[PDB]
Structure 1
Amino acid sequence: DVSLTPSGIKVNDEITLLYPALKYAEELYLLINQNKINFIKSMAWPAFVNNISDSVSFIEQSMIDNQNEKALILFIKYKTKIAGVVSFNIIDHANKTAYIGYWLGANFQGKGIVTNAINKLIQEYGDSGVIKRFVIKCIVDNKKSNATALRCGFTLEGVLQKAEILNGVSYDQNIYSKVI
């Protein structure tokens, strides 16, 4: 499979999913900083990114988790730029289940980048038999995240009551799955 390269997974001509490396720390930090105000509306971590060392710490932990298959953290490269992150935030090996996460900088939204990334990951991990069940959990009111889940052919399984906390407030989640 020529799309599986040493630097990452080649989705298409424009998109590569990069394996984390410390060299990406600065660009990733600047991307987060540029998107901090908008990101806080949907995710819990951005309020806690204040300096480049927070980016370094994230990369260090991601590399540890990738090494030990606790997670699969990938940096989305669109053309020449890091666009965001797509991940298996949790890999449950015993149950062959992966829980998916994603985010994109504002300047990279509306381009099908995450949908293309997710389709590629499900091909590579699903059709190979490594993962049988893929899961997306997202807050009910998150319009774009719900749209992405459906765009990727996931099926709504239920509503998880008060399951995700942002700023001390618990919100309901939709849980979606794609089963191989």
Structure 2
Amino acid sequence: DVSLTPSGIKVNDEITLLYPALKYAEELYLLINQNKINFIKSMAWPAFVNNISDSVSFIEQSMIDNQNEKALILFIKYKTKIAGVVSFNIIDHANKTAYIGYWLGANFQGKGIVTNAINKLIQEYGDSGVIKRFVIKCIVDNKKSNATALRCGFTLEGVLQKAEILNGVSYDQNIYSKVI
């Protein structure tokens, strides 16, 4: 499979999902910083990304988790730029289940980049038999994340009451799945 390269997973001519490396710390930090105000509305970690050292630490932890297959953290490259992150935030090997997360900088939204990335990951891990069940959980009022889950052919399984906390407030999540 020529799409599986040493540097990452080639989605299409414009998108590669890069394995994390320290060389990406600066670009990743700057991207988060540019998007911090908007990102804080939907995620709980951007509020605390205050220096490049925070991105370095994130990369270091991501590399450890990737090595040990606790997670699969990938940096989305669109054309020449890091565009965001797509991940299996949790890999449950015993139950062949992966829980998916994602974000894109504002300048990278509206281009199908995450939908294309997720479809590629599900092909690679799902059609190979590594993962049987893919899961997306997202806050009920997160319009774009819900739309992405549906665009990727996931099915709504239910609502998880008060399951995600942002800034001390618990929000309901939709839970979606795609089963191979």
Q: Distance in 1 between matches of 2:179 and 2:143?
A: 23
Return the offset for 1:133: 0.1
**Aligned positions of 1:7-46 closer than 5 A:** 7-46=7-46
* Partners of 1:4 and 1:78 in 2: CA distance: 17
Percent sequence identity is 100
Deviation at 1:74, TM superposition (A): 0.0
C-alpha deviation, 1:109, in angstroms: 0.1
TM-superposition CA deviations, 1:114-155 (whole Å, max 9, x none): 000000000000000000000000000000000000000000
Residues 8-61 of structure 1: per-residue CA shift (max 9 Å, x gap)? 000000000000000000000000000000000000000010000000000000
- Work out the CA distance in 1 between the residues paired with 2:30 and 2:36: 10
Q: CA–CA distance in 2 between the matches of 1:60 and 1:126?
A: 27
For the residue of structure 2 that corresponds to 1:153, the secondary structure is coil
CA distance in 1, matches of 2:48, 2:91: 24
2:68 — aligned with what?
68
Unaligned runs of 5+ in 2: none
The within-5 A match list for 1:44-123 is 44-123=44-123
TM-score (ref. length: structure 1): 1.00
SS of residue matched to 1:70:
coil
Give how far 1:178 is off. 0.1
In structure 1, the gaps of 5 or more residues are: none
Aligned length: 180
**What is the deviation of 1:89?**
0.1
Between the aligned partners of 1:167 and 1:45, the Cα distance in structure 2 is 10
* Counterpart residue number, 2:136: 136
Deviation at residue 113 of structure 1 after TM alignment: 0.1
Query: Quick one: distance in 2 between partners of 1:160 and 1:107?
Result: 31
Q: CA deviation at 1:76?
A: 0.1
In angstroms, what is the RMSD of aligned CA positions? 0.1
- The CA distance in 2 between the partners of 1:24 and 1:135, in whole Å, is 27
> Residue 50 of structure 1: SS of its match in structure 2?
coil
Q: Deviations over 1:71-91 (max 9, x none)?
A: 000000000000000000000
SS of 1:56 mapped into structure 2: helix
**CA distance, structure 2, for counterparts of residue 48 and residue 127 of structure 1:** 37
User: What secondary structure, in the 3-state scheme, does the structure 1 residue paired with 2:17 have?
Assistant: strand
